[PDB]
From Swiss-Prot, chain A:
Record's signal peptide: none
Coiled-coil stretches: 162-183, 436-459, 501-524
Disease: Charcot-Marie-Tooth disease, axonal, type 2O: An axonal form of Charcot-Marie-Tooth disease, a disorder of the peripheral nervous system, characterized by progressive weakness and atrophy, initially of the peroneal muscles and later of the distal muscles of the arms. Charcot-Marie-Tooth disease is classified in two main groups on the basis of electrophysiologic properties and histopathology: primary peripheral demyelinating neuropathies (designated CMT1 when they are dominantly inherited) and primary peripheral axonal neuropathies (CMT2). Cortical dysplasia, complex, with other brain malformations 13: An autosomal dominant disorder characterized by global developmental delay with impaired intellectual development. Some patients show signs of peripheral neuropathy, such as abnormal gait and hyporeflexia. CDCBM13 is associated with variable neuronal migration defects resulting in cortical malformations.
Species of provenance: Homo sapiens
Subunit text: Homodimer. The cytoplasmic dynein 1 complex consists of two catalytic heavy chains (HCs) and a number of non-catalytic subunits presented by intermediate chains (ICs), light intermediate chains (LICs) and light chains (LCs); the composition seems to vary in respect to the IC, LIC and LC composition. The heavy chain homodimer serves as a scaffold for the probable homodimeric assembly of the respective non-catalytic subunits. The ICs and LICs bind directly to the HC dimer and dynein LCs assemble on the IC dimer. Interacts with DYNC1LI1; DYNC1LI1 and DYNC1LI2 bind mutually exclusive to DYNC1H1.
Name of the featured protein: Cytoplasmic dynein 1 heavy chain 1
Function: Cytoplasmic dynein 1 acts as a motor for the intracellular retrograde motility of vesicles and organelles along microtubules. Dynein has ATPase activity; the force-producing power stroke is thought to occur on release of ADP. Plays a role in mitotic spindle assembly and metaphase plate congression.
Subcellular location: Cytoplasm, Cytoskeleton
Residue list for modification Phosphoserine: 51
Free-text domain note: Dynein heavy chains probably consist of an N-terminal stem (which binds cargo and interacts with other dynein components), and the head or motor domain. The motor contains six tandemly-linked AAA domains in the head, which form a ring. A stalk-like structure (formed by two of the coiled coil domains) protrudes between AAA 4 and AAA 5 and terminates in a microtubule-binding site. A seventh domain may also contribute to this ring; it is not clear whether the N-terminus or the C-terminus forms this extra domain.
Family the entry assigns: Belongs to the dynein heavy chain family.
Swiss-Prot record, chain B:
Domain of life: Eukaryota
Protein name (record): Cytoplasmic dynein 1 heavy chain 1
Disulfide links within the chain: none
Domain notes: Dynein heavy chains probably consist of an N-terminal stem (which binds cargo and interacts with other dynein components), and the head or motor domain. The motor contains six tandemly-linked AAA domains in the head, which form a ring. A stalk-like structure (formed by two of the coiled coil domains) protrudes between AAA 4 and AAA 5 and terminates in a microtubule-binding site. A seventh domain may also contribute to this ring; it is not clear whether the N-terminus or the C-terminus forms this extra domain.
Localization, UniProt: Cytoplasm, Cytoskeleton
């Protein structure tokens, strides 16, 4: 509710004590914080924050500013810059503190931190952070109330279990969290003086030496700064390497395009000294008692084993049969493209590509198969597809169906040949692809029944419902069957969801109400015309 | 009486304030600032429904929306996952604000005093009716009353 | 990961100096 407005001093001192540890493991309320923290621009901001019972968001940040300095001697300088915001956003190169008022107006007489909750910002990956931390903060925790509060005991309100289910839907639905940010590399985040000095030591073209750095070649803090810079450089490049795309946050197409880009970039991360300036950087690290940074440019940042980890360079040639399948629009092209990707799977086994991952990629590719045959179905115009044309193109798409099953049982032959491969490698079995394709076919084939069904009626109706082939009723009854085919057509078409099949079921139950009326008529005419004898027109 | 409890996992304790610490940086390093290696959350037990609702609202709506709009992700088609999870977040906020139905106070244990309760229990488990006589001196002691 | 591990003492003293500022709003460790 609305209460006394707190004063700046108490919360200012509280946040001043809280920040420096949370920011740089210490600092004891640095003066840069207090400079603009006491500033009227921020002061009136927190005054409005405390007073207004409508704003409950705030952002206090302290960017370790990377001040670019043009003076010769170095590249950059570390800086401190406190920032104040009333709206919250991702601060760049900095972690921030947000404060949410649990009470719309906060006072000092009650504990401020009791009526206000603290959030601390992540700069490395804010989205992954917020997701994982909300999960590990609420899921078993809302679960603890789901059990303790007896929400299962009182069934009058069953919306808390549903909100638990939707929290789970979030937590297991987005796990990539916009993964694979496509970071290829970073700059040289090491000691600036050494880099600059080597730069003028080689722009002369005279092979930067040990002595040209002077006493700095043996100065301990200088050398340790070099070490820390090289360590952070290997941190971000091992970051760009550990990016291991999964089929989600994209698709299997995008997964193996990730393999493309990853491999063509780790071709150059095999070492990191390729640039002549970075060659002499290697040389000066060797000179400047950082020869482990040199071998890093050879081994650690010289990430050669990435290639050994990703010897899977035959997926590069897999991208071509997959592309053939992508362009495969005509049914025959689709089947032969499945054959082509299958044969190059026979080829791709040579590399140690993760078969669980690989054939889950083919799972995604199989749902992509469903999508492309859905495009072909839209070409077929399932909404108002013409009956006999429709069963002919069902002959076509069903020979395509048992043919997808032909090279799918061939994918089981691939499972056998990968039994051979696991005899040479072994790996986890879980590589399901099992598509939703049949479901479409299921709907397809069940509709086909309907199709044949009415064709079993209509043509035969053209004679059987006709008297001795009753005029007044049966004219409108042949209309009944035909316009009922229209009514099942006008409501059931290319509807992808199974609700289309359900409306199809309703359509046939009313259709077959009419059809059973026709059966009653024809059996009535039968029995009233019987009783004569067995021969021909009689029986 | 103020006390303390320790939890490896996370758990709702009633009438007991909580501070959660979850590693922002998964790797643990003493040289790495531990406080800057950790992630700090806290909670006081007033009303968990509005707790979760308001905190997730003012924690993810402006942060997430601002970052997707300003980082160029709205111009990137690599992940149309973001609009779907925006709708998901919105329906979280709706469902959690709708969580305002029950006070959830149906019945609570009745406290009188340990002495009278245990005396009554021990004089009844033998098979006899408690009265004013079983307590004895306790019926006219002003402090006990 | 476990390469260097913060000591029990330093982290526990950090929590001891951090908690009272929150659960008592600037108080002292009880």
């Amino acid at each position: 509710a609305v209460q006394n407005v707190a004063d700046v001093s108490v919360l200012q001192k509280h946040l001043r004590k809280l920040v420096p540890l949370l920011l740089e493991d210490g600092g004891e309320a640095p003066a840069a914080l207090e400079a603009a923290l006491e500033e009227k621009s921020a002061l009136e901001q927190m005054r409005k924050f405390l007073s207004d019972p409508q704003v409950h968001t705030v952002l206090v940040e302290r960017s370790t500013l990377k001040e670019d300095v043009g003076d010769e001697g170095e590249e950059e300088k570390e800086f401190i810059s406190y920032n104040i915001n009333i709206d919250i956003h991702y601060g760049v190169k900095s972690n921030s503190l947000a404060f949410i008022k649990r009470t719309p107006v906060i006072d000092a007489d009650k504990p401020v931190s009791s009526q206000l909750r603290v959030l601390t910002l992540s700069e490395d990956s804010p989205y992954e952070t917020l997701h994982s931390f909300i999960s590990n903060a609420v899921a078993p925790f809302f679960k603890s109330y789901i059990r303790e509060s007896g929400k299962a005991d009182r069934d009058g309100d069953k919306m808390a279990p549903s909100v638990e289910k939707k929290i789970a839907e979030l937590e297991m639905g987005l796990l990539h969290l916009q993964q694979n940010i496509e970071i290829p590399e970073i700059s040289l985040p090491i000691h600036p003086m050494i880099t600059n000095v080597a730069k003028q030591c080689y722009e002369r073209g005279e092979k930067p030496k040990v002595t040209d750095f002077g006493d700095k070649v043996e100065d301990p803090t200088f050398l340790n700064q070099l070490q820390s810079g090289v360590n952070r450089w290997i941190r971000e490049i091992q970051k760009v390497t550990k990016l291991d795309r999964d089929p989600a946050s994209g698709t299997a197409l995008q997964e193996i395009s990730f393999w493309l880009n990853l491999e063509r970039a780790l071709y150059r991360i095999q070492e990191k000294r390729e640039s002549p300036e970075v060659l002499l950087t290697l040389d000066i690290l060797k000179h400047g008692k950082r020869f482990h940074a040199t071998v890093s440019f050879d081994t650690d940042t010289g990430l050669k084993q990435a290639l050994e980890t990703v010897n899977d360079y035959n997926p590069l040639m897999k991208d071509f049969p997959l592309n053939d399948l992508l362009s495969a629009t005509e049914l025959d092209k689709i089947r032969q493209a499945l054959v082509a990707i299958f044969t190059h799977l026979r080829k791709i086994r040579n590399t140690k590509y993760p078969i669980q991952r690989a054939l889950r990629l083919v799972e995604a590719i199989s749902r992509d198969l469903s999508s492309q045959l859905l495009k072909v179905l839209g070409t077929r115009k399932l909404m108002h597809v013409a009956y006999e044309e429709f069963e002919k193109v069902m002959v076509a798409c069903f020979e395509v169906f048992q043919t997808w099953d032909d090279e799918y049982e061939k994918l089981q032959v691939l499972l056998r040949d990968i039994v051979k491969r696991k005899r040479e490698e072994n790996l986890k079995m879980v590589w399901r692809i099992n598509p939703a394709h049949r479901k479409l076919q299921a709907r397809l084939d069940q509709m086909r029944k309907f199709r044949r069904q009415h064709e079993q009626l209509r043509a035969v109706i053209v004679r059987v419902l006709r008297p001795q082939v009753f005029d007044a009723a049966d004219a409108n009854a042949i209309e009944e069957v035909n316009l009922a085919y229209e009514n099942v057509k006008e409501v059931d078409g290319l509807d992808v969801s199974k609700e289309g099949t359900e409306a199809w079921e309703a359509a046939m139950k009313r259709y077959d109400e009419r059809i059973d009326r026709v059966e009653t008529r024809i059996t009535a005419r039968l029995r009233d015309q019987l009783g004569t004898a067995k021969n021909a027109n009689e029986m």
